Structures are given as structure tokens and as C-alpha cells.
Coordinates of C-alpha atoms in Angstrom, one line a residue:
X24 CA 0.1 0.1 0.0
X25 CA 0.7 3.7 -0.2
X26 CA -0.5 6.3 2.0
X27 CA -0.1 10.2 2.1
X28 CA 1.0 11.5 5.6
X29 CA 1.3 15.0 4.6
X30 CA 0.9 17.1 1.6
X31 CA 2.5 20.7 0.5
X32 CA 0.9 22.3 -2.3
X33 CA 3.6 24.9 -3.8
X34 CA 2.7 28.3 -5.3
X35 CA 3.8 27.3 -8.6
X36 CA 1.4 24.2 -8.8
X37 CA 3.4 21.4 -7.5
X38 CA 2.4 18.9 -4.9
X39 CA 5.0 17.7 -2.3
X40 CA 4.1 14.6 -0.5
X41 CA 5.5 12.4 2.4
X42 CA 4.7 8.8 2.2
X43 CA 5.5 5.7 4.1
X44 CA 5.8 3.0 1.4
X45 CA 8.1 0.5 0.1
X46 CA 9.5 3.0 -2.5
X47 CA 10.1 0.0 -5.0
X48 CA 6.3 -0.3 -4.9
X49 CA 5.2 3.4 -5.6
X50 CA 3.4 3.7 -8.7
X51 CA 5.4 7.0 -9.8
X52 CA 6.8 7.9 -12.9
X53 CA 10.3 7.8 -11.6
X54 CA 11.9 6.5 -8.5
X55 CA 15.5 8.1 -7.5
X56 CA 18.3 5.4 -6.5
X57 CA 20.9 6.7 -4.6
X58 CA 24.2 4.8 -5.7
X59 CA 28.0 5.5 -6.0
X60 CA 29.9 6.0 -9.3
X61 CA 29.5 2.5 -10.4
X62 CA 26.1 2.0 -10.2
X63 CA 26.2 -0.3 -7.3
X64 CA 23.0 -2.0 -6.1
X65 CA 22.6 -2.0 -2.3
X66 CA 21.5 0.3 0.6
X67 CA 17.7 0.3 1.4
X68 CA 16.5 1.4 -1.9
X69 CA 18.9 -0.7 -4.2
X70 CA 18.0 -3.7 -2.4
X71 CA 14.1 -3.2 -2.8
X72 CA 14.3 -2.1 -6.3
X73 CA 16.2 -5.4 -6.9
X74 CA 13.4 -7.4 -4.6
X75 CA 10.8 -6.0 -7.1
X76 CA 12.5 -6.1 -10.5
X77 CA 15.0 -8.7 -10.4
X78 CA 16.9 -9.6 -13.5
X79 CA 15.2 -7.0 -15.7
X80 CA 15.7 -4.4 -13.2
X81 CA 19.4 -5.4 -12.7
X82 CA 20.0 -5.8 -16.6
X83 CA 18.9 -2.0 -17.3
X84 CA 21.0 -0.8 -14.5
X85 CA 24.4 -3.0 -16.3
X86 CA 23.3 -1.7 -19.6
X87 CA 23.1 1.7 -18.2
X88 CA 26.7 1.4 -16.7
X89 CA 28.1 0.4 -19.9
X90 CA 26.6 3.4 -22.0
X91 CA 27.2 6.0 -19.3
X92 CA 30.3 5.3 -17.7
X93 CA 31.2 6.2 -14.2
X94 CA 28.7 8.7 -12.4
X95 CA 30.2 12.1 -11.5
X96 CA 29.6 13.2 -8.1
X97 CA 26.1 14.9 -8.1
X98 CA 25.5 13.1 -11.4
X99 CA 22.3 11.2 -12.2
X100 CA 21.4 8.9 -15.1
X101 CA 18.1 7.2 -16.2
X102 CA 17.6 3.6 -16.8
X103 CA 14.2 2.3 -17.9
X104 CA 12.2 0.7 -15.0
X105 CA 11.7 -2.8 -16.6
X106 CA 10.0 -5.1 -14.2
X107 CA 9.1 -2.0 -12.1
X108 CA 5.8 0.0 -11.6
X109 CA 7.8 3.1 -11.9
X110 CA 8.5 3.8 -15.6
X111 CA 12.0 5.2 -14.9
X112 CA 14.8 5.0 -12.4
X113 CA 16.9 7.8 -12.0
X114 CA 20.3 6.9 -10.3
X115 CA 22.2 9.6 -8.5
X116 CA 25.6 9.7 -6.6
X117 CA 25.2 12.0 -3.8
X118 CA 28.0 13.9 -2.2
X119 CA 29.6 12.5 1.1
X120 CA 29.0 14.5 4.2
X121 CA 32.2 16.5 5.0
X122 CA 33.3 17.1 1.5
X123 CA 33.7 20.6 0.6
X124 CA 30.6 22.0 -1.1
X125 CA 28.9 18.8 0.0
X126 CA 25.9 20.8 0.7
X127 CA 25.9 22.6 -2.7
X128 CA 26.5 19.1 -4.4
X129 CA 23.5 17.5 -2.8
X130 CA 21.4 20.5 -4.2
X131 CA 22.9 19.8 -7.3
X132 CA 22.2 16.2 -7.0
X133 CA 18.7 16.8 -6.5
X134 CA 18.5 19.1 -9.4
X135 CA 20.0 16.7 -11.7
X136 CA 17.4 14.2 -10.8
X137 CA 14.5 16.7 -11.4
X138 CA 16.0 18.0 -14.8
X139 CA 16.3 14.4 -15.9
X140 CA 12.6 13.6 -15.1
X141 CA 11.6 16.8 -17.0
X142 CA 13.9 15.5 -19.8
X143 CA 11.5 12.8 -20.2
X144 CA 8.3 14.8 -19.5
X145 CA 7.7 13.2 -16.3
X146 CA 5.0 14.1 -14.1
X147 CA 5.9 12.6 -10.7
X148 CA 9.1 11.5 -9.0
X149 CA 9.9 9.7 -5.7
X150 CA 13.0 10.5 -3.7
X151 CA 13.8 8.5 -0.6
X152 CA 15.9 10.1 1.9
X153 CA 19.1 10.9 -0.1
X154 CA 22.6 11.4 1.6
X155 CA 21.5 10.6 5.1
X156 CA 22.3 6.8 5.0
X157 CA 25.9 6.0 4.2
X158 CA 26.7 9.4 2.8
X159 CA 26.4 10.5 6.5
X160 CA 24.4 13.5 6.2
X161 CA 22.4 14.6 9.4
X162 CA 18.6 14.0 8.6
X163 CA 17.6 17.5 9.3
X164 CA 20.2 18.9 6.8
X165 CA 19.7 16.4 4.3
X166 CA 16.0 17.4 4.3
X167 CA 16.6 21.1 4.2
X168 CA 18.8 20.9 1.6
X169 CA 16.5 18.5 -0.5
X170 CA 13.8 20.9 0.0
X171 CA 15.5 24.0 -0.8
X172 CA 16.8 22.5 -4.2
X173 CA 13.4 21.3 -5.1
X174 CA 11.8 24.9 -4.2
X175 CA 14.8 26.5 -6.1
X176 CA 14.5 24.3 -8.9
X177 CA 10.7 25.0 -9.3
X178 CA 10.6 28.6 -9.1
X179 CA 13.8 28.7 -11.9
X180 CA 12.2 26.2 -14.3
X181 CA 8.8 27.1 -15.5
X182 CA 8.8 24.8 -18.0
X183 CA 8.9 21.9 -15.7
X184 CA 6.7 19.1 -16.3
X185 CA 6.8 17.5 -12.7
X186 CA 3.5 18.0 -10.8
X187 CA 4.1 15.7 -7.7
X188 CA 7.2 14.8 -5.7
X189 CA 7.3 12.2 -3.1
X190 CA 9.5 11.7 -0.2
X191 CA 9.2 8.0 0.6
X192 CA 10.4 7.3 4.3
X193 CA 10.4 4.2 6.2
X194 CA 11.1 5.5 10.0
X195 CA 9.3 7.8 12.3
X196 CA 12.0 10.5 13.1
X197 CA 12.7 10.9 9.4
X198 CA 9.0 11.6 8.7
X199 CA 8.8 13.9 11.3
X200 CA 11.8 15.9 9.9
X201 CA 10.4 16.1 6.2
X202 CA 6.9 17.1 7.7
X203 CA 8.3 20.1 9.6
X204 CA 10.4 21.0 6.7
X205 CA 8.0 21.0 4.0
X206 CA 5.7 22.8 5.9
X207 CA 8.4 25.9 6.2
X208 CA 8.2 26.1 2.1
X209 CA 5.9 27.9 0.4
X210 CA 7.8 29.3 -1.9

């Protein structure tokens, strides 16, 4: 299942929503997959995507690694969401906490995801908690940078097709954080 916990309707038309769900089951047009520069599949998200999409999901990622080569820090790249409810999967390589411009790099990362979804005229994108796992970002900092990036992007990209963004979270503390942070946005 998939239940909406909290919604922030932005002034420029976009719905931001917080959900608890297996991100792999989200009916969304795109799903974000935090990876490293070699399209490694693990972590929370790597493993559920694989759990859901099996060989197909994995074949597409491998194909994508051949074509794309290494993913720069902040870079994203798309694979087709074969064997997943999602139509596309956007792989991104977030910066590591403590690196210079780690914060700036993370805003870039989020914008790259969004630009790629707009690049394919996608109308929704599901973000998991980017950065805050193994990339070591505090949950408050990650949440604030992400939501700032997203707000910046939309006010700065009028041609954007994206109408809904999901923040998919498994734990209560993270949910409470996103909920508070979204609520601070109007712009």
C-alpha cells in the first residue's frame, strides 16, 4: 500500500507529499536510486528495487553502466524501469558528508534528478532519503537541502512538467523531519 501522510501544495502548482511505503512499489513515473559512481545496487533502496524488479531491473542498470560510464559526484542517469511499477529509475551519486560543497553538491544532485525527469516529461518523482544513510548527512540537513533544491528548481524552471514529488521514508523520526521542513516551504 501507499498512504499520504503530509502534503505541501507549492505556489507554482507542484504537490510535495510524504509517504510511508516500499519506494519500489510506488506507482510513480520515476524513482530515485542513490548509488555510487559504478551503479552499485545495495542500501535500503538498491535492495528493494532489486527485490521488486529482479533480472530486468538489474539488466537495465548494467546496460546503463556500459553506456554511461562512471557517474560523477552529483551526477544522475536514467534507466528504464523494466520490471518495476515506476516507468523510470534515476540513479544519482550524492556527495559525502564532510566533503567541501557537500551541501551545494547535494542541491545539484537533486536538481539533476529533477532535470532528468523533466527531460522525459515525467509528472511524478519519488525521492527516498538522499544523503542521510551512508553518505552520513544529518537527517535535518539532508531534508533541508533537498527541499531547498526542489523549491529553487521549480521557481527557476517554469517549463518543468513535474507535478508531484514524493518523499518516501521508512522511519518515524525522518517522517517528522520532512513534515516539519516541507511545512516551512511555501516558495
